[PDB]
mmCIF file of C-alpha atoms (C1' of nucleotides) and ligand atoms in Angstrom:
data_model
loop_
_atom_site.group_PDB
_atom_site.id
_atom_site.type_symbol
_atom_site.label_atom_id
_atom_site.label_comp_id
_atom_site.label_asym_id
_atom_site.label_seq_id
_atom_site.Cartn_x
_atom_site.Cartn_y
_atom_site.Cartn_z
ATOM 1 C CA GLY A 1 -12.426 20.397 -19.828
ATOM 2 C CA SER A 2 -12.313 16.588 -19.763
ATOM 3 C CA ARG A 3 -9.031 14.671 -19.277
ATOM 4 C CA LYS A 4 -7.736 11.377 -20.685
ATOM 5 C CA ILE A 5 -6.397 8.947 -18.014
ATOM 6 C CA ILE A 6 -4.986 5.465 -18.653
ATOM 7 C CA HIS A 7 -4.453 3.010 -15.825
ATOM 8 C CA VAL A 8 -2.022 0.276 -16.907
ATOM 9 C CA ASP A 9 -1.845 -2.932 -14.751
ATOM 10 C CA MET A 10 0.253 -6.000 -15.209
ATOM 11 C CA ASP A 11 -1.884 -9.088 -14.623
ATOM 12 C CA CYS A 12 -0.731 -11.780 -12.218
ATOM 13 C CA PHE A 13 2.507 -9.788 -12.278
ATOM 14 C CA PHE A 14 4.823 -11.868 -10.097
ATOM 15 C CA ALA A 15 3.299 -15.102 -11.372
ATOM 16 C CA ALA A 16 3.605 -13.854 -14.983
ATOM 17 C CA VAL A 17 7.323 -13.235 -14.726
ATOM 18 C CA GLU A 18 7.822 -16.574 -13.051
ATOM 19 C CA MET A 19 6.047 -18.278 -16.017
ATOM 20 C CA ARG A 20 7.788 -16.355 -18.735
ATOM 21 C CA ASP A 21 11.062 -17.446 -17.194
ATOM 22 C CA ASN A 22 9.812 -20.931 -16.381
ATOM 23 C CA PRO A 23 7.373 -22.234 -18.996
ATOM 24 C CA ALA A 24 6.819 -25.432 -16.990
ATOM 25 C CA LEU A 25 4.876 -23.339 -14.441
ATOM 26 C CA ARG A 26 2.424 -22.257 -17.100
ATOM 27 C CA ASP A 27 -0.689 -24.450 -16.885
ATOM 28 C CA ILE A 28 -0.381 -25.619 -13.264
ATOM 29 C CA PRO A 29 -1.345 -23.697 -10.096
ATOM 30 C CA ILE A 30 1.486 -21.557 -8.658
ATOM 31 C CA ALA A 31 1.794 -18.749 -6.189
ATOM 32 C CA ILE A 32 4.348 -16.421 -4.646
ATOM 33 C CA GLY A 33 4.401 -16.431 -0.819
ATOM 34 C CA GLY A 34 5.859 -17.637 2.481
ATOM 35 C CA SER A 35 5.483 -21.297 3.441
ATOM 36 C CA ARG A 36 2.843 -22.879 5.698
ATOM 37 C CA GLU A 37 5.468 -23.431 8.447
ATOM 38 C CA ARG A 38 6.747 -19.913 7.924
ATOM 39 C CA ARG A 39 3.386 -18.340 8.781
ATOM 40 C CA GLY A 40 3.347 -16.741 5.279
ATOM 41 C CA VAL A 41 0.659 -15.370 2.940
ATOM 42 C CA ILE A 42 0.156 -15.367 -0.801
ATOM 43 C CA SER A 43 1.543 -12.373 -2.648
ATOM 44 C CA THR A 44 -0.198 -13.349 -5.851
ATOM 45 C CA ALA A 45 -1.197 -16.440 -7.787
ATOM 46 C CA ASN A 46 -1.519 -17.495 -11.407
ATOM 47 C CA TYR A 47 -4.916 -18.156 -12.954
ATOM 48 C CA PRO A 48 -4.853 -21.957 -12.642
ATOM 49 C CA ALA A 49 -4.510 -21.348 -8.857
ATOM 50 C CA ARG A 50 -7.153 -18.625 -8.626
ATOM 51 C CA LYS A 51 -9.537 -21.196 -10.126
ATOM 52 C CA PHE A 52 -9.289 -22.981 -6.728
ATOM 53 C CA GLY A 53 -9.938 -19.752 -4.868
ATOM 54 C CA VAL A 54 -6.433 -18.650 -4.133
ATOM 55 C CA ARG A 55 -6.300 -14.867 -3.517
ATOM 56 C CA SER A 56 -3.483 -12.428 -2.628
ATOM 57 C CA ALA A 57 -3.139 -11.377 1.017
ATOM 58 C CA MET A 58 -4.374 -14.801 1.965
ATOM 59 C CA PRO A 59 -2.751 -17.205 4.453
ATOM 60 C CA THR A 60 -0.800 -20.006 2.771
ATOM 61 C CA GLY A 61 -2.544 -22.348 5.221
ATOM 62 C CA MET A 62 -5.822 -21.604 3.533
ATOM 63 C CA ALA A 63 -4.130 -21.578 0.122
ATOM 64 C CA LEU A 64 -3.071 -25.236 0.253
ATOM 65 C CA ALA A 65 -6.267 -26.282 2.052
ATOM 66 C CA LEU A 66 -7.840 -24.951 -1.211
ATOM 67 C CA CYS A 67 -5.294 -26.174 -3.704
ATOM 68 C CA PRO A 68 -3.040 -28.859 -2.328
ATOM 69 C CA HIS A 69 -0.966 -29.073 -5.567
ATOM 70 C CA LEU A 70 -0.100 -25.362 -5.242
ATOM 71 C CA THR A 71 3.471 -24.648 -6.130
ATOM 72 C CA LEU A 72 4.987 -22.180 -3.689
ATOM 73 C CA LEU A 73 7.599 -19.764 -4.819
ATOM 74 C CA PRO A 74 9.717 -17.376 -2.746
ATOM 75 C CA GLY A 75 9.919 -14.789 -5.548
ATOM 76 C CA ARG A 76 12.613 -12.742 -7.214
ATOM 77 C CA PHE A 77 12.170 -9.019 -6.717
ATOM 78 C CA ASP A 78 14.949 -7.940 -9.090
ATOM 79 C CA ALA A 79 13.194 -9.748 -11.866
ATOM 80 C CA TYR A 80 9.950 -7.897 -11.056
ATOM 81 C CA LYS A 81 11.802 -4.612 -10.650
ATOM 82 C CA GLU A 82 13.542 -5.061 -13.986
ATOM 83 C CA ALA A 83 10.192 -5.550 -15.586
ATOM 84 C CA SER A 84 8.845 -2.546 -13.787
ATOM 85 C CA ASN A 85 11.602 -0.250 -15.023
ATOM 86 C CA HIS A 86 11.163 -1.488 -18.575
ATOM 87 C CA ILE A 87 7.388 -0.832 -18.559
ATOM 88 C CA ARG A 88 7.990 2.637 -17.137
ATOM 89 C CA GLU A 89 10.419 3.371 -19.933
ATOM 90 C CA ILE A 90 7.764 2.124 -22.348
ATOM 91 C CA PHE A 91 5.330 4.582 -20.701
ATOM 92 C CA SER A 92 7.924 7.304 -21.122
ATOM 93 C CA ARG A 93 7.791 6.865 -24.872
ATOM 94 C CA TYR A 94 4.181 8.177 -24.806
ATOM 95 C CA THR A 95 4.088 10.748 -22.004
ATOM 96 C CA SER A 96 6.137 12.145 -19.181
ATOM 97 C CA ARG A 97 2.992 12.440 -17.050
ATOM 98 C CA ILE A 98 3.429 9.041 -15.320
ATOM 99 C CA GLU A 99 2.424 8.226 -11.690
ATOM 100 C CA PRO A 100 3.480 4.733 -10.657
ATOM 101 C CA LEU A 101 1.400 3.259 -7.871
ATOM 102 C CA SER A 102 3.670 0.208 -7.459
ATOM 103 C CA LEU A 103 5.917 -2.104 -9.504
ATOM 104 C CA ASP A 104 3.102 -3.132 -11.859
ATOM 105 C CA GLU A 105 0.796 -0.148 -11.977
ATOM 106 C CA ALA A 106 0.844 3.362 -13.408
ATOM 107 C CA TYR A 107 -1.451 6.250 -14.139
ATOM 108 C CA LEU A 108 -0.826 8.058 -17.435
ATOM 109 C CA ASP A 109 -2.246 11.442 -18.450
ATOM 110 C CA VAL A 110 -2.412 11.452 -22.241
ATOM 111 C CA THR A 111 -4.810 14.424 -22.729
ATOM 112 C CA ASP A 112 -2.078 16.629 -24.230
ATOM 113 C CA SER A 113 -0.507 13.843 -26.212
ATOM 114 C CA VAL A 114 -0.469 13.905 -29.985
ATOM 115 C CA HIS A 115 0.708 10.280 -30.407
ATOM 116 C CA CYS A 116 -2.168 8.163 -31.648
ATOM 117 C CA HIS A 117 -4.384 10.870 -33.058
ATOM 118 C CA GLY A 118 -4.964 11.731 -29.402
ATOM 119 C CA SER A 119 -6.737 8.412 -29.066
ATOM 120 C CA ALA A 120 -6.276 7.302 -25.483
ATOM 121 C CA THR A 121 -7.712 3.939 -26.498
ATOM 122 C CA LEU A 122 -5.124 3.387 -29.245
ATOM 123 C CA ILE A 123 -2.422 4.602 -26.890
ATOM 124 C CA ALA A 124 -3.349 2.107 -24.196
ATOM 125 C CA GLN A 125 -3.664 -0.637 -26.794
ATOM 126 C CA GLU A 126 -0.243 0.239 -28.262
ATOM 127 C CA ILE A 127 1.190 0.174 -24.765
ATOM 128 C CA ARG A 128 -0.302 -3.274 -23.909
ATOM 129 C CA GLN A 129 1.230 -4.274 -27.198
ATOM 130 C CA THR A 130 5.030 -3.571 -27.112
ATOM 131 C CA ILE A 131 4.743 -4.641 -23.474
ATOM 132 C CA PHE A 132 3.818 -8.115 -24.638
ATOM 133 C CA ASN A 133 6.590 -7.625 -27.205
ATOM 134 C CA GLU A 134 10.098 -7.127 -25.695
ATOM 135 C CA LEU A 135 8.897 -8.461 -22.316
ATOM 136 C CA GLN A 136 6.695 -11.436 -23.272
ATOM 137 C CA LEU A 137 4.283 -10.417 -20.468
ATOM 138 C CA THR A 138 0.629 -9.319 -20.399
ATOM 139 C CA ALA A 139 -0.956 -6.046 -19.252
ATOM 140 C CA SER A 140 -4.498 -4.731 -18.849
ATOM 141 C CA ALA A 141 -5.702 -1.171 -19.139
ATOM 142 C CA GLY A 142 -8.515 1.213 -18.213
ATOM 143 C CA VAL A 143 -9.402 4.564 -19.867
ATOM 144 C CA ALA A 144 -11.495 7.219 -18.188
ATOM 145 C CA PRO A 145 -11.669 10.967 -17.584
ATOM 146 C CA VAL A 146 -10.283 10.483 -14.069
ATOM 147 C CA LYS A 147 -8.014 8.294 -11.963
ATOM 148 C CA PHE A 148 -10.384 6.072 -10.032
ATOM 149 C CA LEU A 149 -12.720 5.334 -12.917
ATOM 150 C CA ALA A 150 -9.690 4.328 -15.066
ATOM 151 C CA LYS A 151 -8.583 2.096 -12.220
ATOM 152 C CA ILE A 152 -11.924 0.333 -11.882
ATOM 153 C CA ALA A 153 -11.894 0.030 -15.740
ATOM 154 C CA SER A 154 -8.502 -1.626 -15.873
ATOM 155 C CA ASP A 155 -9.777 -4.694 -14.032
ATOM 156 C CA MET A 156 -12.916 -5.121 -16.154
ATOM 157 C CA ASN A 157 -11.359 -6.847 -19.148
ATOM 158 C CA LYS A 158 -8.446 -8.511 -17.486
ATOM 159 C CA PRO A 159 -6.349 -10.495 -18.340
ATOM 160 C CA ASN A 160 -4.972 -9.137 -21.582
ATOM 161 C CA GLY A 161 -7.672 -6.594 -22.231
ATOM 162 C CA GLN A 162 -8.667 -3.005 -21.798
ATOM 163 C CA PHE A 163 -11.858 -1.076 -21.000
ATOM 164 C CA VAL A 164 -12.840 2.520 -21.894
ATOM 165 C CA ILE A 165 -15.396 4.718 -20.059
ATOM 166 C CA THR A 166 -16.335 7.936 -21.873
ATOM 167 C CA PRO A 167 -17.920 10.834 -19.985
ATOM 168 C CA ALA A 168 -21.253 9.930 -21.544
ATOM 169 C CA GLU A 169 -21.067 6.394 -20.051
ATOM 170 C CA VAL A 170 -20.066 7.658 -16.637
ATOM 171 C CA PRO A 171 -23.406 8.349 -15.013
ATOM 172 C CA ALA A 172 -24.739 4.962 -16.103
ATOM 173 C CA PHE A 173 -21.561 3.317 -14.860
ATOM 174 C CA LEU A 174 -21.787 4.835 -11.401
ATOM 175 C CA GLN A 175 -25.366 3.876 -10.882
ATOM 176 C CA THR A 176 -24.698 0.234 -10.120
ATOM 177 C CA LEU A 177 -21.058 0.717 -9.144
ATOM 178 C CA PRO A 178 -20.639 -0.769 -5.661
ATOM 179 C CA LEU A 179 -18.813 1.483 -3.188
ATOM 180 C CA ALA A 180 -16.316 -1.293 -2.359
ATOM 181 C CA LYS A 181 -14.936 -1.105 -5.851
ATOM 182 C CA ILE A 182 -13.762 2.380 -5.120
ATOM 183 C CA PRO A 183 -10.050 2.399 -4.193
ATOM 184 C CA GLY A 184 -9.863 3.485 -0.532
ATOM 185 C CA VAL A 185 -13.019 1.651 0.530
ATOM 186 C CA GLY A 186 -11.820 -1.598 2.116
ATOM 187 C CA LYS A 187 -13.802 -4.048 4.246
ATOM 188 C CA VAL A 188 -14.446 -1.879 7.258
ATOM 189 C CA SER A 189 -15.837 1.195 5.478
ATOM 190 C CA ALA A 190 -17.825 -1.021 3.148
ATOM 191 C CA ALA A 191 -19.348 -2.644 6.193
ATOM 192 C CA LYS A 192 -20.343 0.689 7.771
ATOM 193 C CA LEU A 193 -21.833 1.898 4.549
ATOM 194 C CA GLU A 194 -23.761 -1.345 4.064
ATOM 195 C CA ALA A 195 -24.946 -1.080 7.667
ATOM 196 C CA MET A 196 -26.546 2.220 6.777
ATOM 197 C CA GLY A 197 -27.916 0.845 3.498
ATOM 198 C CA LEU A 198 -25.248 2.216 1.166
ATOM 199 C CA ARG A 199 -23.959 -0.250 -1.394
ATOM 200 C CA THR A 200 -23.478 1.592 -4.712
ATOM 201 C CA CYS A 201 -22.598 5.104 -5.737
ATOM 202 C CA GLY A 202 -26.219 5.272 -6.941
ATOM 203 C CA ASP A 203 -27.176 4.909 -3.259
ATOM 204 C CA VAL A 204 -24.974 7.781 -2.034
ATOM 205 C CA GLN A 205 -25.925 10.263 -4.737
ATOM 206 C CA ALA A 206 -29.226 10.364 -2.821
ATOM 207 C CA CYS A 207 -27.374 11.212 0.433
ATOM 208 C CA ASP A 208 -26.567 14.414 2.221
ATOM 209 C CA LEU A 209 -22.973 15.692 2.108
ATOM 210 C CA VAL A 210 -23.334 17.335 5.505
ATOM 211 C CA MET A 211 -24.270 14.075 7.206
ATOM 212 C CA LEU A 212 -21.620 12.191 5.246
ATOM 213 C CA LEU A 213 -19.008 14.631 6.528
ATOM 214 C CA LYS A 214 -20.401 14.264 10.083
ATOM 215 C CA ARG A 215 -20.124 10.453 9.850
ATOM 216 C CA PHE A 216 -16.870 9.891 7.902
ATOM 217 C CA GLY A 217 -15.212 13.325 7.989
ATOM 218 C CA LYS A 218 -13.058 14.016 4.904
ATOM 219 C CA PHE A 219 -13.576 10.438 3.735
ATOM 220 C CA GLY A 220 -17.291 11.305 3.322
ATOM 221 C CA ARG A 221 -16.426 14.128 0.976
ATOM 222 C CA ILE A 222 -14.248 11.668 -0.943
ATOM 223 C CA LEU A 223 -17.048 9.165 -1.222
ATOM 224 C CA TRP A 224 -19.595 11.775 -2.288
ATOM 225 C CA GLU A 225 -17.207 13.102 -4.939
ATOM 226 C CA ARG A 226 -16.195 9.794 -6.357
ATOM 227 C CA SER A 227 -19.893 8.852 -6.496
ATOM 228 C CA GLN A 228 -20.725 11.931 -8.504
ATOM 229 C CA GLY A 229 -17.860 10.724 -10.677
ATOM 230 C CA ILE A 230 -15.701 13.628 -9.437
ATOM 231 C CA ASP A 231 -11.955 13.006 -9.085
ATOM 232 C CA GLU A 232 -9.890 16.184 -9.507
ATOM 233 C CA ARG A 233 -6.792 14.283 -8.405
ATOM 234 C CA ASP A 234 -4.102 15.280 -10.853
ATOM 235 C CA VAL A 235 -1.701 12.668 -12.165
ATOM 236 C CA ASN A 236 1.561 13.494 -10.454
ATOM 237 C CA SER A 237 4.956 12.046 -11.405
ATOM 238 C CA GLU A 238 6.738 14.106 -8.693
ATOM 239 C CA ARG A 239 5.955 11.781 -5.745
ATOM 240 C CA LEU A 240 8.717 10.512 -3.498
ATOM 241 C CA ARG A 241 9.267 7.841 -0.937
ATOM 242 C CA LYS A 242 8.674 9.127 2.637
ATOM 243 C CA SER A 243 9.901 6.203 4.735
ATOM 244 C CA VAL A 244 11.500 2.798 4.837
ATOM 245 C CA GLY A 245 11.229 -0.146 7.080
ATOM 246 C CA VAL A 246 12.185 -3.755 7.438
ATOM 247 C CA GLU A 247 10.166 -6.309 9.370
ATOM 248 C CA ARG A 248 9.999 -10.020 10.029
ATOM 249 C CA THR A 249 7.628 -12.622 11.419
ATOM 250 C CA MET A 250 9.316 -15.758 12.781
ATOM 251 C CA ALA A 251 7.919 -19.270 12.414
ATOM 252 C CA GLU A 252 7.163 -19.447 16.191
ATOM 253 C CA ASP A 253 6.419 -16.706 18.564
ATOM 254 C CA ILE A 254 9.336 -15.607 20.655
ATOM 255 C CA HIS A 255 9.128 -14.966 24.392
ATOM 256 C CA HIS A 256 12.651 -13.862 25.405
ATOM 257 C CA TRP A 257 14.298 -10.524 24.771
ATOM 258 C CA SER A 258 17.501 -12.316 23.852
ATOM 259 C CA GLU A 259 15.607 -13.674 20.868
ATOM 260 C CA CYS A 260 14.139 -10.290 19.977
ATOM 261 C CA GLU A 261 17.648 -8.898 20.094
ATOM 262 C CA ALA A 262 18.907 -11.685 17.917
ATOM 263 C CA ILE A 263 16.296 -10.588 15.402
ATOM 264 C CA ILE A 264 17.180 -6.939 15.495
ATOM 265 C CA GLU A 265 20.809 -7.830 14.859
ATOM 266 C CA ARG A 266 19.800 -9.445 11.582
ATOM 267 C CA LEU A 267 17.310 -6.755 10.543
ATOM 268 C CA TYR A 268 19.630 -3.757 10.972
ATOM 269 C CA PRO A 269 22.150 -4.412 8.226
ATOM 270 C CA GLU A 270 19.191 -4.822 5.881
ATOM 271 C CA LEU A 271 17.716 -1.538 6.875
ATOM 272 C CA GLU A 272 21.120 0.107 6.522
ATOM 273 C CA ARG A 273 21.915 -1.171 3.039
ATOM 274 C CA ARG A 274 18.490 -0.178 1.856
ATOM 275 C CA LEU A 275 18.644 3.291 3.263
ATOM 276 C CA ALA A 276 22.158 3.783 1.898
ATOM 277 C CA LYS A 277 20.757 3.217 -1.606
ATOM 278 C CA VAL A 278 18.825 6.493 -1.372
ATOM 279 C CA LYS A 279 20.677 8.204 1.479
ATOM 280 C CA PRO A 280 24.356 7.322 1.711
ATOM 281 C CA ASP A 281 25.000 9.586 4.700
ATOM 282 C CA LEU A 282 22.163 7.685 6.398
ATOM 283 C CA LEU A 283 20.555 10.920 7.497
ATOM 284 C CA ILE A 284 16.972 10.502 8.627
ATOM 285 C CA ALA A 285 14.240 12.486 10.411
ATOM 286 C CA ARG A 286 12.881 9.804 12.751
ATOM 287 C CA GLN A 287 13.709 6.172 13.506
ATOM 288 C CA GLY A 288 11.887 3.569 15.615
ATOM 289 C CA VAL A 289 10.615 0.007 15.943
ATOM 290 C CA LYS A 290 7.626 -2.263 15.749
ATOM 291 C CA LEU A 291 6.414 -5.377 17.588
ATOM 292 C CA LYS A 292 3.275 -7.349 17.011
ATOM 293 C CA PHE A 293 2.043 -9.825 19.515
ATOM 294 C CA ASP A 294 -0.065 -12.993 19.654
ATOM 295 C CA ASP A 295 -3.270 -11.041 20.131
ATOM 296 C CA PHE A 296 -2.060 -9.399 16.925
ATOM 297 C CA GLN A 297 -2.120 -5.936 18.434
ATOM 298 C CA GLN A 298 0.721 -3.932 16.944
ATOM 299 C CA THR A 299 2.723 -1.270 18.666
ATOM 300 C CA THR A 300 5.309 1.122 17.207
ATOM 301 C CA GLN A 301 7.768 3.377 18.923
ATOM 302 C CA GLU A 302 9.265 6.086 16.835
ATOM 303 C CA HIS A 303 11.053 9.295 17.744
ATOM 304 C CA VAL A 304 12.998 12.128 16.124
ATOM 305 C CA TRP A 305 16.598 10.999 15.438
ATOM 306 C CA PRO A 306 19.356 12.439 13.209
ATOM 307 C CA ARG A 307 20.854 9.333 11.634
ATOM 308 C CA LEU A 308 20.129 5.624 11.444
ATOM 309 C CA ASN A 309 21.579 4.209 14.638
ATOM 310 C CA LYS A 310 21.567 0.521 15.589
ATOM 311 C CA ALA A 311 21.967 0.763 19.384
ATOM 312 C CA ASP A 312 19.155 3.255 19.780
ATOM 313 C CA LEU A 313 16.889 0.910 17.873
ATOM 314 C CA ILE A 314 17.961 -1.932 20.150
ATOM 315 C CA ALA A 315 17.373 0.259 23.254
ATOM 316 C CA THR A 316 13.918 1.496 22.289
ATOM 317 C CA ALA A 317 13.124 -2.037 21.240
ATOM 318 C CA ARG A 318 13.976 -3.234 24.743
ATOM 319 C CA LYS A 319 11.863 -0.425 26.326
ATOM 320 C CA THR A 320 9.006 -1.442 24.013
ATOM 321 C CA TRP A 321 9.540 -5.078 24.918
ATOM 322 C CA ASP A 322 9.244 -4.328 28.575
ATOM 323 C CA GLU A 323 6.715 -1.577 28.823
ATOM 324 C CA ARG A 324 4.084 -3.285 26.667
ATOM 325 C CA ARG A 325 4.324 -6.960 26.012
ATOM 326 C CA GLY A 326 2.470 -8.045 29.165
ATOM 327 C CA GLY A 327 3.618 -11.596 28.736
ATOM 328 C CA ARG A 328 2.211 -11.959 25.181
ATOM 329 C CA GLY A 329 4.096 -13.926 22.514
ATOM 330 C CA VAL A 330 5.758 -12.002 19.711
ATOM 331 C CA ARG A 331 5.437 -12.861 16.039
ATOM 332 C CA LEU A 332 7.182 -9.956 14.378
ATOM 333 C CA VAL A 333 9.986 -7.521 14.978
ATOM 334 C CA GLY A 334 10.381 -4.532 12.702
ATOM 335 C CA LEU A 335 12.669 -1.555 12.210
ATOM 336 C CA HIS A 336 11.628 1.788 10.684
ATOM 337 C CA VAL A 337 12.909 5.220 9.558
ATOM 338 C CA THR A 338 11.123 8.376 8.398
ATOM 339 C CA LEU A 339 13.097 10.206 5.685
ATOM 340 C CA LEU A 340 13.842 13.919 5.716
ATOM 341 C CA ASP A 341 11.191 16.279 4.215
ATOM 342 C CA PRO A 342 12.699 17.314 0.863
ATOM 343 C "C1'" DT B 1 -6.844 -22.222 7.730
ATOM 344 C "C1'" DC B 2 -5.104 -18.067 10.929
ATOM 345 C "C1'" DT B 3 -3.470 -14.340 9.243
ATOM 346 C "C1'" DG B 4 3.895 -10.776 4.729
ATOM 347 C "C1'" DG B 5 6.225 -7.100 3.880
ATOM 348 C "C1'" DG B 6 6.507 -2.771 1.624
ATOM 349 C "C1'" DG B 7 4.427 1.322 1.676
ATOM 350 C "C1'" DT B 8 0.539 5.838 1.847
ATOM 351 C "C1'" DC B 9 -2.690 8.717 4.087
ATOM 352 C "C1'" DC B 10 -5.646 10.124 7.979
ATOM 353 C "C1'" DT B 11 -6.954 11.089 12.865
ATOM 354 C "C1'" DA B 12 -6.245 12.840 17.371
ATOM 355 C "C1'" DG B 13 -4.385 14.598 21.942
ATOM 356 C "C1'" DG B 14 -0.514 17.330 24.151
ATOM 357 C "C1'" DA B 15 3.176 20.235 23.561
ATOM 358 C "C1'" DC B 16 4.519 24.426 22.044
ATOM 359 C "C1'" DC B 17 3.839 28.905 19.976
ATOM 360 C "C1'" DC B 18 1.012 33.438 19.257
ATOM 361 C "C1'" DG C 1 -8.509 28.733 20.254
ATOM 362 C "C1'" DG C 2 -5.840 28.049 15.481
ATOM 363 C "C1'" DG C 3 -1.326 26.150 13.359
ATOM 364 C "C1'" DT C 4 2.025 22.783 13.652
ATOM 365 C "C1'" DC C 5 5.169 19.369 15.442
ATOM 366 C "C1'" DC C 6 5.347 14.980 17.980
ATOM 367 C "C1'" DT C 7 3.903 10.222 18.595
ATOM 368 C "C1'" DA C 8 0.622 6.103 18.134
ATOM 369 C "C1'" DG C 9 -2.498 3.717 15.697
ATOM 370 C "C1'" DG C 10 -5.852 2.324 12.074
ATOM 371 C "C1'" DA C 11 -7.548 1.607 7.359
ATOM 372 C "C1'" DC C 12 -6.049 0.807 2.976
ATOM 373 C "C1'" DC C 13 -3.285 -0.703 -1.201
ATOM 374 C "C1'" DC C 14 0.061 -3.694 -3.926
HETATM 375 N N1 0KX D 1 -1.871 -7.964 -1.167
HETATM 376 C C1 0KX D 1 -0.947 -7.973 -2.156
HETATM 377 C C2 0KX D 1 -1.320 -7.582 -3.450
HETATM 378 C C3 0KX D 1 -0.389 -7.591 -4.488
HETATM 379 N N2 0KX D 1 0.878 -7.972 -4.222
HETATM 380 C C4 0KX D 1 1.900 -7.984 -5.297
HETATM 381 C C5 0KX D 1 1.912 -9.303 -6.038
HETATM 382 C C6 0KX D 1 1.305 -8.999 -7.402
HETATM 383 O O1 0KX D 1 2.028 -9.681 -8.448
HETATM 384 C C7 0KX D 1 1.527 -7.499 -7.543
HETATM 385 C C8 0KX D 1 0.512 -6.737 -8.419
HETATM 386 O O2 0KX D 1 -0.582 -6.232 -7.670
HETATM 387 P P1 0KX D 1 -2.068 -6.688 -8.086
HETATM 388 O O3 0KX D 1 -2.324 -6.143 -9.490
HETATM 389 O O4 0KX D 1 -3.052 -6.412 -6.945
HETATM 390 N N3 0KX D 1 -1.809 -8.269 -8.269
HETATM 391 P P2 0KX D 1 -1.952 -9.064 -9.646
HETATM 392 O O5 0KX D 1 -1.075 -8.364 -10.655
HETATM 393 O O6 0KX D 1 -1.667 -10.517 -9.436
HETATM 394 O O7 0KX D 1 -3.522 -8.937 -9.844
HETATM 395 P P3 0KX D 1 -4.100 -8.948 -11.321
HETATM 396 O O8 0KX D 1 -3.685 -7.571 -11.829
HETATM 397 O O9 0KX D 1 -3.308 -10.000 -12.003
HETATM 398 O O10 0KX D 1 -5.563 -9.183 -11.194
HETATM 399 O O11 0KX D 1 1.564 -6.967 -6.241
HETATM 400 C C9 0KX D 1 1.220 -8.337 -2.903
HETATM 401 O O12 0KX D 1 2.399 -8.684 -2.683
HETATM 402 N N4 0KX D 1 0.307 -8.344 -1.889
HETATM 403 MG MG1 MG D 2 -2.080 -4.043 -9.571
HETATM 404 MG MG1 MG D 3 -1.844 -6.351 -11.627
#
DNA sequence: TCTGGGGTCCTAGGACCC
DNA sequence: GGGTCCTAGGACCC
């Protein structure tokens, strides 16, 4: 019993919406992120800017060093959110079985759909179309019998394209598929696997599951499965937010508690308004805080607590500030809450 | 050039329970 | 000693 999964992905999502709305931004390098002086990074960039080597999650310092004409934008989340909602409604026209992964992404299970002669390919294509219509933005797609494979597929013919992997193509596909392409294998893991000669799924198929479990625990099992092409992960649609936090990095490190306090004062209303949106009584399971120093180490203090309370956060933030700052500078203050379990 | 902010999931020791 | 809650931290993703 094979399934039909479609990963839809908006390309250069933030950038795209900026360009739709401002056509002057179209053929010149632009990016969303914090400024040089604000210690910020790039959220995303448009394709003119990628040309120069500008990637997401990358320090704006490096970004301008690479592309001095870069246009920096602060970004408008309601605009992106509005787009998101729209594209999710568009998904809803084709299935209910929809698992968003973020603003711009979603898994669809279309197996039991009778829309386009059960053609997942025509479904994805009809979805990329109608998204370009009524939004004037561009989406890419990947079709596969499972989640991860559809995900890797969605970035194969981007921008403005889609890629299908049938079960017959799968084994061939996995052979040369590098482990780092698998979602959940970042830099560190990739580096351990390389260090033991593992680069592609091909390489792990020849490995022993026992040893892989000994070395990576449950992550080994995951690897092994994904390598065999196995991904029994069901598309969900029922998933819910488990937590919420608000954090900030200042332009210069701060050294006095008064300043840390001054930060918390400004962060709390934010955290409150945001939590109210989904929990008007403000009733939480745990709250707590977060500092990160100059030596970038990051500590968090969080405890059980009935309802978002400002002074407690201030208190525990002072404890934290004393009991483990050892004279280091501080670059970010952050508040956090863990929502109740329903 | 020097490292966001919003999240998820996983691990692991002690506490606590049986 | 096996669950499970508590807290801290790390790797990962968008
Ligand atoms: N590290 C990251 C990665 C993505 N993002 C945001 C900005 C992007 O517009 C958005 C979409 O995620 P993404 O698909 O990884 N990025 P983007 O859509 O630009 O990549 P492509 O799909 O265009 O290749 O998430 C971020 O803020 N920080
Ligand atoms: Mg994406
Ligand atoms: Mg995208």
